[PDB]
Structure 1
């Protein structure tokens, strides 16, 4: 099965998917994030951040509080399973994480932690 997904974040605070399934036969899983919009990171930064559904709002809230200098994630946040950099117009960043960090049954969310983006920029991820 495939163990990679391409995802874009744009100038209208939208991700171009809101559902990812990770095949259980994948040992690693890669996210390729890009930003085909015009706006820079300090205005319309997007990251791909992954947590349990339960942990999402805390990571977002503490992330807002951490500020731009920290890519809007709180330092040493163990709730974050994986994440990309926060990127701006025309940038790219990819990450690969260990699929064994995930667990069958559990619900995961991906989302952007730039202030106010997570209402519109979020989706589910599920080991299947």
Structure 2
């Protein structure tokens, strides 16, 4: 099966997908984030951050607290299963992670931890 997905978010908080399926036969999985648009990362940055559903709230909240110079992620956050950098317009970042970190049956969410962006850019990731 395929083991990659392309994800983009613009200056308008508009993104291409709210649901990612990771096939169970993938050993690694890659997310390629891009940002169409004209605003820089300090004004309208986006990241892609993966945790269980239950951990999403805390990761988001602690991330906002940590600020731009930490890419809005609390340092050393063991709840983050994988994540891209925070990017701004015209930029691109890709993360490849080990699919052995995911357990069929558990509920995962992906999301942007830039302040407030969690409300509009988030989604489910499922291992099938």
- Shared fold (TM-score greater than 0.5)? yes
CA distances 1:48-77 after superposition (whole Å, capped 9, x unpaired)? 000000000100000000000000000000
Aligned to 1:83: 83
1:16 Cα deviation after fit: 1.3
SS in 2 for 1:80: coil
Q: What is the root-mean-square deviation of aligned Cα atoms in Å? A: 0.5
Distance in 1 (CA, whole Å) between partners of 2:13 and 2:68 is 17
Give the C-alpha shift of residue 22 in structure 1.
0.2
C-alpha distance in 1, partners of 2:110/2:65? Answer: 19
Question: Is 1:106 matched up with 2:106?
Answer: yes
Q: Displacement of 1:37 after TM fit?
A: 1.1
Partner of 1:120: 120
Preserved CA contact (<8 Å) 1:2 1:23: yes
Q: Which runs of 5+ in 2 are unaligned?
A: none
- Partner secondary structure for residue 93 of structure 2: strand
Tell me the secondary structure at the aligned position of residue 61 of structure 2: helix
TM-score, structure 1 as length reference:
0.99
Paired residues of 1:15 and 1:122 also in contact (CA < 8 A) = no
Which runs of 5 or more structure 1 residues have no equivalent in the other structure?
Answer: none
- The alpha-carbon deviation at position 12 of structure 1 amounts to 1.0
**Is the partner of 2:54 in helix, strand or coil?**
coil
Identify the residue that residue 25 of structure 2 maps to in structure 1: 25
Q: Judge which range, 100-109 or 12-21, deviates more.
A: 12-21
Runs of 4+ in 1 over 3 A off after TM superposition: none
Question: What TM-score does the superposition give when structure 2 sets the normalisation length?
Answer: 0.99
1:68-115 CA deviation, whole Å, 9 max, x = no partner?
000000000000000000000000000100000000100100000000
Count of residues in Structure 1 that have an aligned counterpart in Structure 2: 128
